[PDB]
Amino acid sequence: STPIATFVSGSPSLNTYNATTVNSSANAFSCAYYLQQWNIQGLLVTSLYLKLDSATMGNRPGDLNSANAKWFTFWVSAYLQQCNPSGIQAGTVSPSTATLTDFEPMANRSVTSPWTYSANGYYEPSIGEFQVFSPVVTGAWNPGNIGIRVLPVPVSASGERYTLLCYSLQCTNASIFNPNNSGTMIVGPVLYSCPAASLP
Amino acid sequence: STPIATFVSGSPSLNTYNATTVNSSANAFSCAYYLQQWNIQGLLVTSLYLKLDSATMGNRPGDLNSANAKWFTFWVSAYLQQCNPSGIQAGTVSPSTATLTDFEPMANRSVTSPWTYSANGYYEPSIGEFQVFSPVVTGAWNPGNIGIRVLPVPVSASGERYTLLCYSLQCTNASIFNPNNSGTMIVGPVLYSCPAASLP
Amino acid sequence: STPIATFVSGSPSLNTYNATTVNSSANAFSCAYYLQQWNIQGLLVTSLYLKLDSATMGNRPGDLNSANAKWFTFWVSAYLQQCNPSGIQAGTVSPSTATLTDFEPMANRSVTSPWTYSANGYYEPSIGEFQVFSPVVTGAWNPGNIGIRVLPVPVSASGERYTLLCYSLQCTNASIFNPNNSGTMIVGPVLYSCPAASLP
Numbered sequence A, B, C: 001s002t003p004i005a006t007f008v009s010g011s012p013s014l015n016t017y018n019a020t021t022v023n024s025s026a027n028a029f030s031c032a033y034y035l036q037q038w039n040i041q042g043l044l045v046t047s048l049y050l051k052l053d054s055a056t057m058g059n060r061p062g063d064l065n066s067a068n069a070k071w072f073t074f075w076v077s078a079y080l081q082q083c084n085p086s087g088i089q090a091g092t093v094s095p096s097t098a099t100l101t102d103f104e105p106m107a108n109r110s111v112t113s114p115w116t117y118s119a120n121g122y123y124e125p126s127i128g129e130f131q132v133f134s135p136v137v138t139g140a141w142n143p144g145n146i147g148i149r150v151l152p153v154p155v156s157a158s159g160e161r162y163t164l165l166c167y168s169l170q171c172t173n174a175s176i177f178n179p180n181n182s183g184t185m186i187v188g189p190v191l192y193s194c195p196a197a198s199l200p
Helices: none
Strands: A004-010 A019-023 A028-040 A043-053 A071-076 A092-094 A128-134 A136-139 A146-157 A160-171 A183-195 B004-010 B019-023 B028-040 B043-053 B071-076 B092-094 B128-134 B136-139 B146-157 B160-171 B183-195 C004-010 C019-023 C028-040 C043-053 C071-076 C092-094 C128-134 C136-139 C146-157 C160-171 C183-195
Touching: A028 A071, A043 A071, A043 A160, A043 C183, A128 A183, A146 A183, A160 A183, A183 B043, A183 B183, A183 C183, B028 B071, B043 B071, B043 B160, B128 B183, B146 B183, B160 B183, B183 C043, B183 C183, C028 C071, C043 C071, C043 C160, C128 C183, C146 C183, C160 C183
Parallel strands: none
Antiparallel strands: A004 A028, A004 A092, A019 A028, A019 A071, A028 A043, A043 A183, A071 A160, A128 A146, A128 B128, A128 C128, A136 A183, A146 A160, B004 B028, B004 B092, B019 B028, B019 B071, B028 B043, B043 B183, B071 B160, B128 B146, B128 C128, B136 B183, B146 B160, C004 C028, C004 C092, C019 C028, C019 C071, C028 C043, C043 C183, C071 C160, C128 C146, C136 C183, C146 C160
């Protein structure tokens, strides 16, 4: 077969806000992303950009707890109909014979108990690799450094198990979820490699 | 030739404890691992899981020094007979014409003086890249975050030089080497890329 | 076409000091490097070693500000004539039909305003991924840990835009730019992956 498959999805301009992220106060928001993936003979390499904008993200509750939220979770999925909590969009696979199941991560060998899938449930991974990024911010958003916990996570839905890539983005400062602050934030490219579930 | 070679070794369940790790108090232990490697046109990509279990690791000396140990070293080798201090097991290479020498890292250009190979010697690398992981832990094991120093290291044995991949796993808290504490710990997948010594 | 292209440049021994780095006090220095790159079906993987040596780097101003400098910037470019602030040398591309434009990074989706290219200008990136290395040091050089900010950066020159890979190396301690201290420092291999601008 083909030794290498690729997948590209999302908004190249980061100006289309068609995905979803849930923060630690269980508030759901619209976000933009750009996703580029490779399956290189069973190695899954994933590049991701994420953007939030006060003007497109949605209502930000006031209440101290909500306004002081710092963490939010984003999910990259290869199961766009069956287990897609962050609403990854249909994209382009190369070559033409590849399919999105070429982009499922191999199960995480450190984790057994799965997350029960919700459309708006907040999942906070406390295990796995930790990366640090400085974000690109505009306006009155001042999150500071963004820590990123990233790992393959087993997710249960309707008696089926899926492994998804989970990103917990962890602001240094409360800022971006406070409705009194307008602004934007972009982080990336966040790179993550792991074994793929199959060969392309 | 083939542009891409792969190697897989170890325990998929992490329930077979056939490798070896030495900690900073020079105490040797049995551990489980799962190793997946790629040589992509001379780029070596390595994925590793590691597991320790109080019930299989071996005797844990008491003595303050031993019980308060936090660091341990694991070695990934492509020289399973000649220079294999952590006891990587025979595995599966793809394609059929590839050999394990396809998985030797290129020499580290920052290091000249080699480590003198021992079957039970403790080597503590103080140079190189540093990654941080949160482990998956059970029972009364509470190591906290695991720092990971990882790099290709030159190793001497019987007038021959080998480059191996060295991992120093560095617990935040003394816990796992204290014989009064039962538990387990899994870390991974730890990803590391470096130039390969050759093309596959 | 070829799914995989490679590029190799610089000094394998790190003993040829033909590249350039500018530090935070705007002092320019000669340095050695070794650069190995892959374009794997549009994924750009870059391995870099960097070396400074008091005996080859050039004049180190005294003046408190200069001597206490800790950060310096290195640029990897695929535009060796048009936009090459660190003086990457001509190298070897494989296969024979590949060219250096196969190694241009895709534009950074988080950054719009470019850096105005200088031959000796200091650029300090404050956004992007952050890695940590322990360096290999000799003599009276004691920089401690080296933080590394690394990202693709848009650069303007003569009405043309280029994306280059920018590395900000950030010493923990003032040491290496103090003319009273002789020594050397090597860091690497620093690995960085990002999307490539094109397929090879």
